[PDB]
Symmetry: D3
Subunit: 105 residues, 6 copies
């Protein structure tokens, strides 16, 4: 099992969700986040850029496809398009049923 995490521009969220759903990939968690001076006495960084974090739990066999869908859909060519990364999931449980591993995907 893999976790795919993507930090992307907020206005791409709808397009990413639709592209995954047409690939049969449903299930996604979205969190608002920020990437990147003024003195007030300390120093404060003043300008933030809004992003969304998209998290998809996925089978090993579909991990690469999900990455490519998000990359291709989130891309605008301009700078700040963001990053996608993969981490390993060692255990997975569906709360409702208690199914584990593949059965929980």
């Amino acid at each position: 099992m893999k976790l795919i995490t993507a930090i992307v521009k907020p206005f791409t969220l709808t397009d990413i969700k639709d592209a995954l759903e047409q690939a049969g990939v449903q299930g996604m968690t979205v969190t608002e986040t920020q990437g990147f001076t003024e003195v007030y006495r300390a120093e404060y960084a003043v300008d933030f850029v809004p992003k969304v974090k998209i998290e998809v739990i996925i089978s090993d066999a579909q991990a690469e496809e999900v990455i490519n869908i998000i990359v291709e859909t989130a891309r605008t060519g301009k700078v700040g398009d963001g990053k996608v990364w993969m981490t390993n999931i060692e255990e997975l449980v569906r709360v409702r049923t208690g199914e584990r591993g593949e059965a929980a995907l």
Copy 2:
């Protein structure tokens, strides 16, 4: 060391916190999120290898309503852990 992450219904949060505290599990970070809007909370716990499966079972059994939307719980390996205040590492940082 393991990271336990759960996406659960917001109204289960206090019950999960209480269930974990009686198991001696202290630290917990809580982030508002949403999924497929439906508001959820992400709960994250850093736990020893020996207690990690117990923590998963506590969260699963306490977050369960039997209805759709109950969420998922997963485990990620932690390769290094440092407690900021002391600089202790590994098991000593837990």
Copy 3:
């Protein structure tokens, strides 16, 4: 490739950003989060900072964040490392070190 995640007090944020930037490390993500009546009342505002980093720089980045986020008082938080199995730059599709 490594992900460094830290839960720290909100007022350390600029000091951490500057200290990372000083070490040539850019690109951090910041998320508001929190730690800890019948019908929990109090919450403690925290920030989660995440930094994608090469294996060669991972320990240095951990050390910068730990030293920069420390107050000596309870609640200072924790810093941890997870392994990244694939990194992609959205703009180019580049992987690995070319995506840093």
Copy 4:
């Protein structure tokens, strides 16, 4: 027209919404807020209502948000001098 604003404990939100719905009042907006390095989460509820119904709406929110302990919050009324429904361009009472 009146704006009714209330700062209330988050777990009373659905009960207030249902009590207002039974009174025929629809269209509330809900914003996370916090009040008084340690905050207590509250929700701000805002309702736009006719002059004739405004005091009833205050009573519903007060009675449904009350727990009898500290933190129950406050409810207040602001005068609305003009109101427009975006979809139709209706104004005043027709926008309610």
Copy 5:
């Protein structure tokens, strides 16, 4: 002096900001908010509709024009388009200078 408040769909936000700018109106505030069941131990509304609250401080002379710009720019013709309202401002202060009234706009 007036406060104009509007609850509108989030994708109209840039169009509204642009139309206000074209009219020489700047200084809007934007707040994420929600419009509108599961029982647990009791009742809980299950889902929400994302909205944005927009607030603009405006002279009396320009208040109707600003209302009309926001209404025409936020409109889609679909349900959920929101509402725009005006409240009276009894004192306005610019923090930097302490200037009141028209000097604070």
Copy 6:
């Protein structure tokens, strides 16, 4: 009764709260909000500036004092220091007791 609303830089919040407390003014609600290049994606503003909205319900007799405390504390002299404004409160109720008006302050 009056409502004092202030849009100020987030790093001034603690100093404003302490200044209001040492003046005997208790009770405040704080909301995260944003003020305002342009990116096209098919038009989207991207650079947001974080602010906090502070709201204080106050008696008529202390309204001016509260405005001046917030203004003087939130001021840094730089641009973006924000604005403070006053609106009239026609009715006020303390939820816990049902006290009204002055008794609810």
